[PDB]
Design a protein around this ligand. Sequence first.
Ligand SMILES: [K+]
Ligand SMILES: [K+]
Ligand SMILES: [K+]
Ligand SMILES: [K+]
Ligand SMILES: [K+]
Ligand SMILES: [K+]
Ligand SMILES: [K+]
Ligand SMILES: [K+]
Ligand SMILES: [K+]
Ligand SMILES: [Mg+2]
Ligand SMILES: [Mg+2]
Ligand SMILES: [Mg+2]
Ligand SMILES: [Mg+2]
Ligand SMILES: [Mg+2]
Ligand SMILES: [Mg+2]
Ligand SMILES: [Mg+2]
Ligand SMILES: [Mg+2]
Ligand SMILES: [Zn+2]
Lengths: 99, 76, 91
Amino acid sequence: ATFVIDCSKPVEDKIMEIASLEKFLQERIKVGGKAGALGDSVTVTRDKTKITVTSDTTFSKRYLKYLTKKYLKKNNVRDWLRVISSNKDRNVYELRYFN
Amino acid sequence: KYRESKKIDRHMYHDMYMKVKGNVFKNKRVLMENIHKTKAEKAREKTLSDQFEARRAKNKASRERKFARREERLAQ
Amino acid sequence: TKRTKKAGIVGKYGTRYGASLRKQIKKMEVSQHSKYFCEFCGKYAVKRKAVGIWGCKDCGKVKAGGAYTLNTASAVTVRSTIRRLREQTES
RNA sequence: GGUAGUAGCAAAUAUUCAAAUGAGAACUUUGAAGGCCGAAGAGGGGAAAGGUUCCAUGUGAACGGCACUUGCACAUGGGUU
RNA sequence: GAACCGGGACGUGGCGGUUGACGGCAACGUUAGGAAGUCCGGAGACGUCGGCGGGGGCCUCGGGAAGAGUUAUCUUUUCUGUUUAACAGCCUGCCCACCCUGGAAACGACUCAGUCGGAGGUAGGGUCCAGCGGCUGGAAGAGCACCGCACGUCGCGUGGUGUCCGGUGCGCCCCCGGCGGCCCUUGAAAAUCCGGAGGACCGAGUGCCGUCCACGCCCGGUCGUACUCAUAACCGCAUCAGGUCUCCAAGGUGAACAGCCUCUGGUCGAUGGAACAAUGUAGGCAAGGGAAGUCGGCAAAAUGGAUCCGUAACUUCGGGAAAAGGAUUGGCUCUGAGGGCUGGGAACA
Ligand SMILES: [K+]
Ligand SMILES: [K+]
Ligand SMILES: [K+]
Ligand SMILES: [K+]
Ligand SMILES: [K+]
Ligand SMILES: [K+]
Ligand SMILES: [K+]
Ligand SMILES: [K+]
Ligand SMILES: [K+]
Ligand SMILES: [Mg+2]
Ligand SMILES: [Mg+2]
Ligand SMILES: [Mg+2]
Ligand SMILES: [Mg+2]
Ligand SMILES: [Mg+2]
Ligand SMILES: [Mg+2]
Ligand SMILES: [Mg+2]
Ligand SMILES: [Mg+2]
Ligand SMILES: [Zn+2]
């Protein structure tokens, strides 16, 4: 299971730090009921505008959405951005403004 | 299921059925234990009887052979 | 276990109506709810449907009998008398 | 007429804040909050009975046992395939 | 948009003529497959109570995805929705009922309870019956949820993604099946529909006689239909705390449509403001005594659920009985017992 978080728009808007989100996901993602135990089973990789999460075992997109929402609340940008599933790709999320 | 698998015969099945209706057995485990104990006791009794009859027959044959030998000695 | 010393079927009435009436109705209660031998099919499967009506569960024959018993005592006497009269007439 | 501006308005837990309209707002409408009915209901339909009370717009007087901008009231229209 | 019913008239195709079909040992099956006076059966068609079983809806648990709520801290967590009508075909075949083979005591089969069997069980193989069962067409094009572009005054505009996979039950509402209990109580009729007994009568050779078969064609009158159904739309002289038949019925606690709290839906409608005198109305408490009060223990208080122990006289033997009289009850962490499916001593995994 591979999932991608798209933050290209906020990155271009200079309101998001891809490295910060990658660190948050690495520290908070739970493997076998324990947080931060990514190791070989779960791998989180970042890019210029996209974050990719891969796990050998089955993974839930909803958990990634919940972690991203927690990060947004922590960084005090939840009131401006929301996590929305992309129309075409079924394994990717996007951060977008709502107004 | 036991009757279908031939672990028990129809007669023992009927007896156990009547006893179950009689509230003899509280649960699965006690019924299984009782069935196993009855089968083991029956097998032990059967094998003991067979051994006793076999040894009796062997002793009778030996006695007959000895009697024939003594009769031959007497005939001389 | 012996549930009732002597009441038996009339125990449903509890302590009502008096001992004598309960004892008197015990006979009817037992007889009308009992099974009776079926002469036609040789089975104990005759049950009362309504007062005076007795049907067999096995062969399906229905007989008109006593209110609370399959055969009243006077029925046998009537049959014997009729048989005697018929034999006299035929002879 | 006196009684007399007196007897009374007291069952069914409960209202509050801001705004809008209006000559006039404790009582109309919007939003927020705090409560109640708690599925054998203060919810959602029928039978009988009623007969337009249904819906829209407007409103002098009367009535809605205080009040009303309001309405099961009044006036004009519409509605039951 | 997609179906059905009743009636009418024909045309095409199909079906029968061994004049009135074929198949199965049988239960019976197949879209068709004669027939008039006369006669016969069934459905309509029926009480009440108890257990059990099946189906539909609801409730409930888990996973996948979509959106939302919380996020000082924790929460792969909390909430919402994740749909499939009539009707047509095929499949399936509950509990019963029925048919074929066979002939049973060492009797067996069997229900929660029963019950069944030489008047033919068990067993093996079949037929039929219900379905608010399954699949497909209807039908995703619809509905719902989510994500976008556009007019931005009047396009009821335009596009995409999903609508997925399982568990569970003395759970609740409805329907059905099959047993059992009760009666000195046995718990409607008719319209209408279906089936059957009989066979008078009836036709031809390349056309005739029939045909409850399929498709095609036409028509379907009259009246009611708004609204309330009630703490103001009915009656009670009223917008009266009274009276007036019935359908639906979520979560928690709990035995429980008890009481108490909550969700959907509804609603804050009972003229308002200030004070907190006496006397009242409704609701509590009260030291010591404990009915001395009073006609009278009126009123109030006391008791109360569940589990365990225990329970007298008398008695119509059924009861009395929850007699009387005693003990326990929270929270937290554990232990033991009570099951289903699959796989050839399987007493196992
Ligand atoms: K005004
Ligand atoms: K009826
Ligand atoms: K009955
Ligand atoms: K229908
Ligand atoms: K006929
Ligand atoms: K109507
Ligand atoms: K009505
Ligand atoms: K006294
Ligand atoms: K006195
Ligand atoms: Mg009810
Ligand atoms: Mg109105
Ligand atoms: Mg009863
Ligand atoms: Mg439940
Ligand atoms: Mg669609
Ligand atoms: Mg005939
Ligand atoms: Mg009048
Ligand atoms: Mg409970
Ligand atoms: Zn008989």
